């Protein structure tokens, strides 16, 4: 087998061993459920919808939230498109491009919403009949195996190199277990479960940081050895 | 940190900025209990007598006096701002923020030099002065 897939195997084993060592039993806690408490308040209603419809709704809501965040200081010269690319409407002056600055948290949220938009758009393309079910599966696999190319997440949080490298390793594993025998190289692999899991496990840890940042930004309000003397 | 005069409302801060016509009004925005503010206030206290000919130093608690938090972006543990004749004198420290000193210094002579540069530039009628030292790096080796 090629050197790259062998390094893929070794890196996957490294991640497995590191996870096994660093495992600690979950801390005891009182069972508090976020969505159950959402239902308790009057601000949330319940229904049943197709997953594609909810995906479109979530994409639109995330776009609206980002637009609200972008046009918070009345920065009308910054435009967010529907693919979640922050672009200027004009040739910005130096002061304009300095005041139009956002932290790494904002861009990380934008790229996360961009990934969700990519997934929901692939599902919509499947639902419109433009692409086949096999094509939809292969596109979903390509999305999770090439998050570094489709989105610039690693730029705003370089720890996602771990997730990106893991996705590349899983791509190598699945491709070289898949493109064997009569099956050759080329698109059509599918089997997007691995990258899907990887990025959802990334999200379960990246959620609290973005929750805290968004809550601080959207609110109405914004040892001894050193100073012992 | 506690030996310096304190301003207890926004009107007092405005009057302190307005009162001094021939001296730089150095005002530190923060909290007396914050360690970064403790360091900055110790530095300001060490130089308070030296610069009394061309600078006056006041301390303002941004929780007791929150009237300038939105205006001056006082959302840092410590912040030092310069005013001369009711005008905020910006300084090009090289940190990307030319409006304030949002960290704590360790050299008295450094702060004295910055105060002197601000005083000279403001006397000449300038809204921005260039700091004698750059702070794009901490010069740690």
């Amino acid at each position: 087998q090629p050197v790259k897939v062998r390094v893929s195997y070794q890196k996957l084993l490294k991640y497995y061993v590191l996870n096994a060592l660093k495992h600690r039993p979950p801390k005891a806690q009182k069972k508090r459920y976020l969505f159950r408490s959402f239902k308790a308040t009057k601000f949330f209603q319940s229904t049943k919808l197709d997953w594609v419809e909810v995906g479109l709704q979530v994409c639109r809501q995330g776009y609206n939230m980002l637009n609200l965040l972008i046009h918070r200081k009345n920065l009308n010269y910054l435009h967010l498109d529907y693919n979640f690319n922050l672009k200027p409407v004009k040739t910005l002056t130096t002061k304009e491009r300095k005041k139009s600055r956002f932290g790494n948290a904002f861009h990380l949220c934008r790229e996360v919403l961009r990934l969700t938009k990519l997934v929901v758009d692939s599902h919509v393309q499947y639902r419109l009949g433009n692409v086949d079910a096999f094509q939809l599966a292969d596109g979903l696999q390509y999305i999770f195996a090439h998050v570094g190319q489709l989105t610039g997440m690693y730029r705003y949080k370089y720890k996602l190199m771990r997730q990106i490298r893991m996705c590349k390793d899983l791509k190598h594993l699945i491709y070289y277990r898949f493109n064997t025998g009569p099956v050759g190289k080329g698109p059509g692999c599918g089997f997007w479960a691995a990258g899907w899991r990887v990025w959802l496990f990334f999200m379960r840890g990246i959620t609290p940081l973005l929750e805290r940042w968004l809550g601080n930004l959207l609110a109405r309000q914004f040892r001894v050895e050193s100073h012992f003397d | 940190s506690y030996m310096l005069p304190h301003l207890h409302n926004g009107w007092q801060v405005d009057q302190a900025i307005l009162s001094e016509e021939d001296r730089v009004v150095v005002i530190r925005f923060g909290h007396d209990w914050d360690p970064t503010c403790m360091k900055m206030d110790e530095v300001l206290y060490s130089i308070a007598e030296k610069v009394k000919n061309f600078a006056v130093i006041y301390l303002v608690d941004i929780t007791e006096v929150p009237d300038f938090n939105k205006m001056y972006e006082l959302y840092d543990p410590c912040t030092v701002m310069f005013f001369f004749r009711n005008k905020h004198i910006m300084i090009d420290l090289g940190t990307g923020n030319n409006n304030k000193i949002n960290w704590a210094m360790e050299d008295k002579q450094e702060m004295v030099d910055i105060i002197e540069t601000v005083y000279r530039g403001a006397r000449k009628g300038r809204g921005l002065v260039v700091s004698p030292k750059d702070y794009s790096t901490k010069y740690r080796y």
């Binding site: 139009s100 600055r101 | 009107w11 001056y72």
Partner: peptide, 30 residues
Amino acid sequence: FLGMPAPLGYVPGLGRGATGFTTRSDIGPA
């Protein structure tokens, strides 16, 4: 003057004609 209280109906921002500044958009309550 130190110790004197603020006069009623006084805005410490425009009382002396102070002008604010913005370094970035991710800082400040909208």
